[PDB]
Coordinates of all heavy atoms in Angstrom, one line a residue:
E118 N 91.6 85.6 77.4 CA 91.1 84.8 78.6 C 92.2 84.0 79.1 O 92.3 83.8 80.3 CB 89.9 84.0 78.0 CG 90.2 83.1 76.9 CD 89.0 82.3 76.4 OE1 88.1 82.1 77.3 OE2 89.0 81.8 75.3
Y119 N 93.0 83.4 78.2 CA 94.1 82.5 78.7 C 95.3 83.4 79.3 O 95.9 82.8 80.2 CB 94.6 81.7 77.5 CG 93.7 80.5 77.2 CD1 92.9 80.5 76.1 CD2 93.6 79.4 78.1 CE1 92.0 79.5 75.8 CE2 92.7 78.3 77.7 CZ 92.0 78.4 76.7 OH 91.1 77.4 76.3
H120 N 95.5 84.6 78.8 CA 96.5 85.4 79.4 C 96.0 85.7 80.9 O 96.8 85.4 81.8 CB 96.5 86.8 78.7 CG 97.7 86.9 77.8 ND1 99.0 86.8 78.2 CD2 97.8 87.0 76.5 CE1 99.9 86.9 77.3 NE2 99.2 87.0 76.1
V121 N 94.8 86.0 81.0 CA 94.2 86.3 82.4 C 94.3 85.0 83.3 O 94.7 85.1 84.4 CB 92.8 86.8 82.3 CG1 92.1 86.9 83.7 CG2 92.7 88.1 81.6
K122 N 93.9 83.9 82.7 CA 93.9 82.7 83.4 C 95.3 82.2 83.9 O 95.5 82.0 85.1 CB 93.3 81.5 82.5 CG 91.8 81.5 82.3 CD 91.5 80.8 81.0 CE 90.8 79.4 81.2 NZ 89.6 79.6 81.9
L123 N 96.2 82.3 83.0 CA 97.6 81.9 83.3 C 98.2 82.9 84.4 O 98.9 82.5 85.3 CB 98.5 81.7 82.1 CG 98.1 80.6 81.1 CD1 99.2 80.4 80.1 CD2 97.8 79.3 81.8
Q124 N 97.9 84.1 84.0 CA 98.4 85.2 85.0 C 97.9 84.9 86.4 O 98.6 84.9 87.4 CB 97.9 86.6 84.6 CG 98.6 87.8 85.2 CD 100.1 87.8 84.9 OE1 100.4 87.7 83.7 NE2 100.9 87.9 85.9
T125 N 96.6 84.6 86.5 CA 96.0 84.3 87.8 C 96.7 83.1 88.4 O 97.0 83.1 89.6 CB 94.5 84.0 87.7 OG1 93.9 85.3 87.1 CG2 93.8 83.7 89.0
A126 N 96.8 82.0 87.6 CA 97.5 80.8 88.1 C 98.9 81.1 88.7 O 99.3 80.5 89.7 CB 97.5 79.8 87.0
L127 N 99.6 81.8 87.9 CA 101.1 82.1 88.3 C 101.2 82.6 89.7 O 102.1 82.2 90.5 CB 101.7 82.9 87.3 CG 103.1 83.3 87.4 CD1 104.0 82.1 87.5 CD2 103.6 84.2 86.4
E128 N 100.4 83.6 90.0 CA 100.4 84.2 91.3 C 100.2 83.2 92.4 O 101.0 83.1 93.3 CB 99.2 85.2 91.5 CG 99.4 86.5 90.7 CD 98.4 87.6 91.1 OE1 97.4 87.2 91.7 OE2 98.7 88.7 90.7
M129 N 99.2 82.4 92.3 CA 98.9 81.3 93.3 C 100.0 80.4 93.4 O 100.5 80.1 94.6 CB 97.7 80.5 92.9 CG 96.3 81.2 93.0 SD 95.1 80.4 92.1 CE 95.2 78.7 92.6
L130 N 100.6 79.9 92.3 CA 101.7 79.0 92.3 C 102.9 79.6 93.0 O 103.5 78.9 93.9 CB 102.0 78.7 90.8 CG 101.1 77.6 90.1 CD1 101.7 77.3 88.8 CD2 100.8 76.4 91.0
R131 N 103.2 80.9 92.8 CA 104.2 81.5 93.4 C 104.1 81.6 94.9 O 105.0 81.2 95.7 CB 104.5 83.0 92.9 CG 105.4 83.1 91.7 CD 105.1 84.3 90.8 NE 106.2 84.5 89.8 CZ 106.0 85.4 88.8 NH1 104.9 86.1 88.7 NH2 107.0 85.5 87.9
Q132 N 102.9 82.0 95.3 CA 102.6 82.0 96.8 C 102.8 80.6 97.4 O 103.4 80.4 98.5 CB 101.1 82.5 97.0 CG 100.8 82.9 98.4 CD 99.4 83.5 98.5 OE1 98.7 83.7 97.5 NE2 99.0 83.8 99.7
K133 N 102.2 79.6 96.8 CA 102.3 78.2 97.3 C 103.7 77.8 97.3 O 104.2 77.1 98.3 CB 101.5 77.3 96.4 CG 100.0 77.5 96.5 CD 99.2 76.3 95.8 CE 99.0 75.2 96.7 NZ 98.0 75.5 97.7
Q134 N 104.5 78.1 96.4 CA 106.0 77.8 96.3 C 106.7 78.4 97.5 O 107.4 77.7 98.3 CB 106.6 78.2 95.0 CG 107.9 77.5 94.8 CD 108.8 78.0 93.7 OE1 108.3 78.7 92.8 NE2 110.1 77.7 93.7
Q135 N 106.5 79.7 97.7 CA 107.2 80.4 98.8 C 106.9 79.7 100.1 O 107.7 79.4 101.0 CB 107.0 81.9 98.9 CG 105.5 82.3 99.0 CD 105.4 83.8 99.1 OE1 106.3 84.6 98.9 NE2 104.3 84.2 99.7
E136 N 105.5 79.5 100.4 CA 105.1 78.8 101.5 C 105.7 77.5 101.7 O 106.3 77.1 102.8 CB 103.5 78.6 101.5 CG 102.8 79.9 101.7 CD 101.3 79.7 101.3 OE1 100.8 78.6 100.9 OE2 100.5 80.7 101.5
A137 N 105.7 76.6 100.6 CA 106.4 75.3 100.7 C 107.8 75.4 101.0 O 108.3 74.6 101.9 CB 106.2 74.6 99.4
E138 N 108.5 76.4 100.4 CA 109.9 76.5 100.7 C 110.2 76.9 102.2 O 111.0 76.3 102.8 CB 110.6 77.6 99.8 CG 110.7 77.1 98.4 CD 111.8 76.2 98.2 OE1 112.5 75.8 99.2 OE2 112.1 75.8 97.1
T139 N 109.4 77.9 102.7 CA 109.6 78.2 104.2 C 109.3 77.0 105.0 O 110.1 76.8 106.0 CB 108.6 79.3 104.6 OG1 107.3 79.0 104.3 CG2 109.0 80.6 103.8
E140 N 108.2 76.2 104.7 CA 108.0 75.0 105.4 C 109.2 74.0 105.4 O 109.5 73.5 106.4 CB 106.8 74.3 104.8 CG 106.3 73.1 105.6 CD 105.2 72.3 104.9 OE1 104.7 72.8 103.9 OE2 104.8 71.2 105.4
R141 N 109.8 73.8 104.1 CA 110.9 73.0 104.0 C 112.1 73.4 104.9 O 112.7 72.7 105.6 CB 111.4 73.0 102.5 CG 112.5 72.0 102.3 CD 112.7 71.9 100.8 NE 113.8 70.9 100.5 CZ 114.5 70.8 99.4 NH1 114.2 71.6 98.3 NH2 115.3 69.8 99.1
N142 N 112.3 74.8 104.9 CA 113.3 75.3 105.8 C 113.1 75.0 107.3 O 114.0 74.6 108.0 CB 113.4 76.9 105.6 CG 114.2 77.2 104.4 OD1 115.1 76.5 103.9 ND2 113.8 78.3 103.8
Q143 N 111.9 75.2 107.8 CA 111.5 74.9 109.1 C 111.7 73.4 109.5 O 112.3 73.1 110.5 CB 110.0 75.3 109.4 CG 109.8 76.8 109.4 CD 108.4 77.2 109.5 OE1 107.5 76.4 109.3 NE2 108.2 78.5 109.9
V144 N 111.2 72.5 108.6 CA 111.4 71.1 108.7 C 112.9 70.8 108.9 O 113.4 70.1 109.8 CB 110.9 70.3 107.5 CG1 111.4 68.8 107.6 CG2 109.4 70.4 107.5
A145 N 113.7 71.4 108.0 CA 115.2 71.3 108.0 C 115.8 71.8 109.4 O 116.6 71.2 110.0 CB 115.9 72.1 106.9
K146 N 115.2 72.9 109.9 CA 115.6 73.4 111.1 C 115.3 72.4 112.3 O 116.1 72.3 113.2 CB 114.9 74.8 111.5 CG 115.3 75.9 110.6 CD 116.8 76.1 110.5 CE 117.2 77.1 109.5 NZ 116.9 76.6 108.1
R147 N 114.2 71.7 112.3 CA 114.0 70.8 113.4 C 114.9 69.6 113.4 O 115.1 69.0 114.4 CB 112.5 70.2 113.3 CG 111.5 71.2 113.8 CD 110.1 70.5 114.0 NE 109.6 70.0 112.8 CZ 108.7 70.7 112.0 NH1 108.3 71.9 112.4 NH2 108.2 70.1 110.9
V148 N 115.5 69.2 112.2 CA 116.3 68.0 112.1 C 117.4 67.8 113.1 O 117.4 66.8 113.9 CB 117.0 68.0 110.7 CG1 118.1 66.9 110.6 CG2 116.0 67.8 109.6
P149 N 118.3 68.8 113.3 CA 119.5 68.5 114.3 C 119.0 68.3 115.7 O 119.7 67.5 116.4 CB 120.3 69.8 114.2 CG 119.8 70.5 112.9 CD 118.3 70.2 112.9
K150 N 117.9 68.8 116.1 CA 117.5 68.6 117.5 C 116.6 67.4 117.7 O 116.2 67.1 118.9 CB 116.7 69.9 117.9
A151 N 116.3 66.7 116.6 CA 115.4 65.6 116.7 C 116.1 64.3 116.9 O 117.2 64.2 116.6 CB 114.6 65.5 115.4
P152 N 115.4 63.3 117.6 CA 116.0 62.0 117.7 C 115.9 61.2 116.4 O 115.1 61.6 115.5 CB 115.1 61.3 118.8 CG 113.8 62.1 118.8 CD 114.1 63.5 118.3
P153 N 116.7 60.2 116.2 CA 117.0 59.5 115.0 C 115.8 59.2 114.1 O 115.8 59.4 112.9 CB 117.6 58.2 115.4 CG 118.3 58.5 116.7 CD 117.4 59.5 117.4
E154 N 114.7 58.5 114.7 CA 113.6 58.2 113.9 C 113.0 59.5 113.3 O 112.7 59.6 112.1 CB 112.5 57.5 114.7 CG 112.8 56.0 115.0 CD 113.6 55.8 116.2 OE1 114.0 56.9 116.9 OE2 113.7 54.7 116.8
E155 N 112.8 60.4 114.2 CA 112.2 61.8 113.8 C 113.1 62.4 112.9 O 112.7 63.1 111.9 CB 112.0 62.7 115.0
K156 N 114.4 62.3 113.0 CA 115.4 62.8 112.1 C 115.0 62.3 110.6 O 114.8 63.1 109.7 CB 116.8 62.5 112.4 CG 117.4 63.0 113.7 CD 118.9 62.6 113.8 CE 119.5 63.3 115.0 NZ 118.9 62.7 116.3
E157 N 115.1 60.9 110.5 CA 114.8 60.4 109.2 C 113.5 60.8 108.6 O 113.5 61.1 107.4 CB 114.9 58.8 109.3 CG 116.3 58.3 109.7 CD 117.4 58.7 108.7 OE1 117.0 58.8 107.5 OE2 118.5 58.9 109.1

């Protein structure tokens, strides 16, 4: 049961991580074009 549970959890976590990383990259991409307050 715990094998199955942790297996299930791991998938979700991986998906969420990749999503978060792509988001981070996009945020990073907006930085140079943004004005100072928005930059910070």
Side-chain angles (χ1 to χ4, degrees), residues 118-149 151-154 156-157:
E118 58 181 339
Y119 282 106
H120 261 297
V121 172
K122 288 155 103 63
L123 296 192
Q124 195 66 48
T125 301
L127 182 57
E128 286 189 345
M129 290 165 51
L130 283 185
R131 270 159 172 165
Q132 196 173 354
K133 291 189 89 70
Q134 197 192 343
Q135 60 173 18
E136 290 171 356
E138 286 288 2
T139 57
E140 188 188 354
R141 187 169 184 197
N142 283 330
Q143 290 173 346
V144 171
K146 292 312 173 287
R147 286 191 298 265
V148 169
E154 288 90 348
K156 293 184 177 67
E157 294 304 325

